[PDB]
Amino acid sequence: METYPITVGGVTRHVPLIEPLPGRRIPLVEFLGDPEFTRAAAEALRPLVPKEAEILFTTETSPIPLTHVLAEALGLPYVVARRRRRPYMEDPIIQEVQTGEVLWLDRRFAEKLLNQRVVLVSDVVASGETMRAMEKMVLRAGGHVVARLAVFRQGTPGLAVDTVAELPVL
Amino acid sequence: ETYPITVGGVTRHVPLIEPLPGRRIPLVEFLGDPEFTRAAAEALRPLVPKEAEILFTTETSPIPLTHVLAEALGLPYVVARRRRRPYMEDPIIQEVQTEVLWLDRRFAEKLLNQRVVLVSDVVASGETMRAMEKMVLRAGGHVVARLAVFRQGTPGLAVDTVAELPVL
Ligand SMILES: [Cl-]
Ligand SMILES: [Cl-]
């Protein structure tokens, strides 16, 4: 069982590898279930958050604990876009991720982005398409992105995003 | 238009949803709310057996609740999903009498020989948790407690809660 060592803010994790494309493997980054690794990552991103930031924006599911911890550390709230419509979801902003994934933001969350300086947060950024979709949702709700952050950078994103580590493709 | 629920002194005026005809209930949501989640976590904390070694919850809203509680107690936790996800490793699959739960093999191995505590935001019939308890058994773990912040009616399962959700 092959593992690859990834490190963030002093905390190291030997993680399995996944092959999203033939012969192109990447370490599996998972913050879910891991408070210590999540804390290290949230603390590494914290200094990258603009002092003007008013709310965080992330997508389910793995990024949730990371964003929650960062938000509480910053004393800010945050919102979560879902990857599918959920029962009782209210008049959601639906945004297609340019291929396909579709993001859903409950109206209750959207109302919280109005006139707010938003910071997009993800665990990993690759092409940047997910964040482009997230930003459009921000604009549609009446606010705007003052910063885009992700813990890991995979390859070279087609969008400007601040990251703290590189995720190697093996 | 909104109904007020309180936990640990933190009050939230939440919307109402109708899980059944003419029966509305407060919509408790911890996602996006660190303060409310913190109050709920500290409220659940005293209900956690001292033998507990790992927490077990299901996506999605209970995740931040469980994460905060876990970090406070210095424990790890695992999360069951409500649908198979890409690259999922030989998962434990369990059906709910009411939904199918999926537990990644990497998470199941964390439960082996461990004392487990089930955590949720809201408990009603108690089925989701029964499904979760079976997954723990198959993972070779043992449940020592079942916790939820809110109780909705009377559960057909023994679950410790902090407050009740009225049926309006
Ligand atoms: Cl995910
Ligand atoms: Cl949910």
Side-chain angles (χ1 to χ4, degrees), chain B residues 77-127:
Chain B
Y77 67 99
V78 297
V79 183
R81 317 298 287 274
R82 291 172 179 291
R83 70 173 191 282
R84 175 175 193 298
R85 301 313 307 313
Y87 316 121
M88 193 172 238
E89 186 66 34
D90 176 30
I92 294 180
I93 305 168
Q94 284 285 168
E95 182 181 299
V96 186
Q97 264 188 174
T98 62
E99 290 295 300
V100 185
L101 301 185
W102 300 71
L103 186 58
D104 189 85
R105 186 60 55 178
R106 284 270 307 188
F107 275 154
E109 307 179 319
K110 301 284 184 175
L111 305 185
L112 178 65
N113 301 318
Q114 306 301 296
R115 275 146 172 183
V116 190
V117 171
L118 308 186
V119 178
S120 178
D121 47 4
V122 178
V123 82
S125 60
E127 283 297 300

Side-chain angles (χ1 to χ4, degrees), chain B residues 10 14 45 58 64 70 107 116 123 125 141 149 155:
Chain B
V10 182
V14 306
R45 191 181 196 162
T58 300
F107 275 154
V116 190
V123 82
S125 60
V149 184

Side-chain angles (χ1 to χ4, degrees), chain A residues 82 86, chain B residues 59-62 82:
Chain A
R82 316 302 279 289
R86 290 286 266 157
Chain B
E59 66 181 356
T60 304
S61 298
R82 291 172 179 291

